[PDB]
Amino acid sequence: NLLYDSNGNIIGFKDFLTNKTYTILPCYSGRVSAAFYQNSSSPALLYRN
């Protein structure tokens, strides 16, 4: 019923009512780089990639 990898995570499954397959992928997570000046009121934002 379930699909696993070498690390034990779940990367897929199969529905019981409809008998169809799916894939599981992790969602986005990251930081943001801010360039700030000495006496500035708001820094500049850069979302890399």
Add this chain to the structure above:
Amino acid sequence: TNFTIAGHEEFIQTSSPKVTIDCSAFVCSNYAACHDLLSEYGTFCDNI
């Protein structure tokens, strides 16, 4: 008595990839109790 010109190549490493690591996304990505517990064991994240 007779000569020629020979060529060779040489490589020297001068740089390396710049790796950046943070505490949140590595230890306490999406957990609040994890953050509350990490805020008591000393940061060490400023040092890293």
